[PDB]
Each structure stands twice: as C-alpha cells, then as structure tokens.
Amino acid sequence: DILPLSPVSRNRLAQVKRKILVLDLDETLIHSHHDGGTPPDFILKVVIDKHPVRFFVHKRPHVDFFLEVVSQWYELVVFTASMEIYGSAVADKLDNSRSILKRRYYRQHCTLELGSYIKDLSVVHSDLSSIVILDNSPGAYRSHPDNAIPIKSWFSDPSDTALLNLLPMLDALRFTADVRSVLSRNSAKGSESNSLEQAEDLKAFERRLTEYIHCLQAPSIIAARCRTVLAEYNM
Ligand SMILES: [Mg+2]
C-alpha cells in the first residue's frame, strides 16, 4: 500500500536524516464530545478531578490507514494540549496495539500564550530540519510555522479525505534534508528557493512526486502497485 521507490529516491533517503511527524489529536485525527448523529468509534471512561466522565470519540475518515502509512516514513509523536488522562486514552485506542504512537506530550508540555496552547517543537526534537507538525490550530505551532503542515479542522464530515490527500506530500517531504525547504514556502517574486541547498531539497521533493505522476508507465508489477496506490490515495 506504498508506492515503490526508485533507486535514486532510495539512495537519497539514506543521505538525509530521519524525521519526526508530530500529530495533534482533537479536530486533527479525532473529534470527541462528553455528556450533554452517528455512533462513535469508541467510548472513553475517564475520571477527572475524581468525577467520572464519558467521551464519545469519532475517528476522522481514513485515520487508521493514514497512520499505518506515515508510520513507515516518520517517527510519530502525539503532541496535545489535552490532559494526559484524556490524551493518553485516545492515543492508546488510536494506536490499537500497532506501537506507533508510543511517544506522547500533553498539556504539561505546552506553553500558554494569548489563550492558545503553544506546542514548542524543540521539546520533541530541537533539530528543526527534521521535525514536522500536523495540527488544525495554527496557534499551536505559532513558534514553528516553518515546520507546520496545516489541516482543516474536522468534527463530523463523513466525506473528509484530508488525511488521504496528505500522503504523497508527506512521502515526498521525507526526501528533503531540511523539511523547512518545503514547508517554509507555504510575495511579488516567483522564487520558491533562496539558496542552492533549499533548491536541491525541492528537486528531491519533486522527484518523488514525479514517481507518483508517471508510475503507470512502469512494467507490469510496478504498474500494478501504482494502480493500487492511486486507487487508495484518493487520486
Ligand atoms: Mg487540534
């Protein structure tokens, strides 16, 4: 369920650092509500301030497939402003014994600023060339906009495919030496690059995308894995 890599891309991947994908929970991968219409995916029972509370949790469409794929490309880290008792239980259910969401950071690791919880990425990994955050609240990565992938907030829309639409970009991004080469772009000029090093990172980024676009001109077997990838990645 992952497109085959070219010999060039595979060699490039060995020449660059391993990368971390920081993942938010609420309105990014799940949406939940407590007591006070579709059946929830799971129900958490957590006691907070010694009062028992029920949370009905809905998974964003395709989150399990999404996590299965990106866990092959990045080290996944949960960074949430929720209380550990809640965030930890959600992560346990999301991980579902796959052992990909074992590293978590909760409210006690966020900085509060102008009513927003800031998730200081350097808490997770201070080499900012090799860390990325996927979060629906831009306030959460206010201190690291160059390392952020924004995503629409999700609450219930069953037709949402945003997690699927992120997969080829997240695939291509892991071939850069510095993720900021790509994420820092996203006023009058037409320059996407400001250095030869950034330009080389965009060449690598685009090379992987090229493998997506032209995968159908490959031999039988590679072409069959391509058709599978395109039919699965909502393209
Ligand atoms: Mg959120």
From Swiss-Prot:
Q: Where in the cell is it found?
A: Endoplasmic reticulum membrane; Nucleus membrane
| Coiled-coil intervals, chain numbering | none
* Substrates-to-products reaction catalysed: O-phospho-L-seryl-[protein] + H2O = L-seryl-[protein] + phosphate; O-phospho-L-threonyl-[protein] + H2O = L-threonyl-[protein] + phosphate
Q: Does the keyword Phosphoprotein apply?
A: no
Q: What is its main location?
A: endoplasmic reticulum
> What are the disulphide bonds in this sequence?
none
Question: Which tissues carry this protein?
Answer: Muscle specific with lower expression in other metabolic tissues.
Give the FCP1 homology domain ranges.
Answer: 14-173
Q: What is one GO cellular-component annotation here?
A: Nem1-Spo7 phosphatase complex
EC numbers listed for it are 3.1.3.16
Which keywords does this Swiss-Prot/TrEMBL entry list? Endoplasmic reticulum, Host-virus interaction, Hydrolase, Membrane, Nucleus, Protein phosphatase, Transmembrane, Transmembrane helix
- Specify whether Nucleotide-binding is a keyword of the entry: no
Gene Ontology MF: a single term: protein serine/threonine phosphatase activity
The record describes the dependence of activity on pH as: Optimum pH is 5.5.
Q: How does it sit in the membrane?
A: Single-pass membrane protein
> Which terms does the UniProt entry file under GO BP?
canonical Wnt signaling pathway; gamete generation; mesoderm development; mitotic nuclear membrane disassembly; nuclear envelope organization; positive regulation of canonical Wnt signaling pathway; positive regulation of triglyceride biosynthetic process; protein dephosphorylation
Concerning its family, UniProt says: Belongs to the dullard family.
Described purpose of this protein according to its UniProt entry: Serine/threonine protein phosphatase forming with CNEP1R1 an active phosphatase complex that dephosphorylates and may activate LPIN1 and LPIN2. LPIN1 and LPIN2 are phosphatidate phosphatases that catalyze the conversion of phosphatidic acid to diacylglycerol and control the metabolism of fatty acids at different levels. May indirectly modulate the lipid composition of nuclear and/or endoplasmic reticulum membranes and be required for proper nuclear membrane morphology and/or dynamics. May also indirectly regulate the production of lipid droplets and triacylglycerol.
Oligomeric form and interacting partners: (Microbial infection) Interacts with Chandipura virus matrix protein.
Name of the featured protein: CTD nuclear envelope phosphatase 1
Please tell me the species this chain comes from. Homo sapiens (Human)
Name the gene for this chain: CTDNEP1
Part of the intact protein present: 44 to 237 of 244
